Amino acid sequence: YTIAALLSPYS
Amino acid sequence: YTIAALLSPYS
Amino acid sequence: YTIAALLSPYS
Amino acid sequence: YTIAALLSPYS
Amino acid sequence: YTIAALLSPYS
Amino acid sequence: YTIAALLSPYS
Amino acid sequence: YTIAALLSPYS
Amino acid sequence: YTIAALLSPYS
Amino acid sequence: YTIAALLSPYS
Amino acid sequence: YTIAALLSPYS
Amino acid sequence: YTIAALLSPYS
Amino acid sequence: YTIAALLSPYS
């Protein structure tokens, strides 16, 4: 399989 | 609040 | 020939 | 889960 | 505060 | 699948 | 399997 | 002549 | 899931 | 007999 | 299956 | 007598 995810949650 | 979540469950 | 197979895969 | 299976294959 | 919760999740 | 979650966030 | 055979060949 | 033969081949 | 099977039974 | 088969199953 | 037979009976 | 026979049975 192939997966690419980016998450930059700021407060 | 701040939340970031990713889930890619495969069978 | 003779064959008997059972499969109950759950997610 | 619950599973019940019986197989009596004869030649 | 007052909170009451019950959870019995079965597979 | 089986999931059970409870959240009561107060300010 | 099940087989039953009889042969009495005379000359 | 006299001949008697039986063959029951199964797969 | 992923499955690959080949069968060439001859008599 | 003659048989030729190729299988490249990926997940 | 494969079979080859030859018979030349003379009297 | 004279007899000539050839058989090449392949599977």
UniProtKB/Swiss-Prot annotation, chains A, B, C, D, E, F, G, H, I, J, K, L:
Organism of this sequence: Rattus norvegicus
Additional remarks: This protein binds retinol-binding protein at levels similar to, and the thyroid hormones at levels much higher than, the human protein.
Domain of life: Eukaryota
Tissue and organ distribution: Detected in serum and cerebrospinal fluid (at protein level). Highly expressed in the choroid plexus. Detected at lower levels in the liver.
Function as written in the Swiss-Prot or TrEMBL entry: Thyroid hormone-binding protein. Probably transports thyroxine from the bloodstream to the brain.
The name this protein goes by in its record: Transthyretin
Assembly behavior: Homotetramer. Dimer of dimers. In the homotetramer, subunits assemble around a central channel that can accommodate two ligand molecules. Interacts with RBP4.
Underlying gene: Ttr
Sequence similarity: Belongs to the transthyretin family.
Localization per record: Secreted
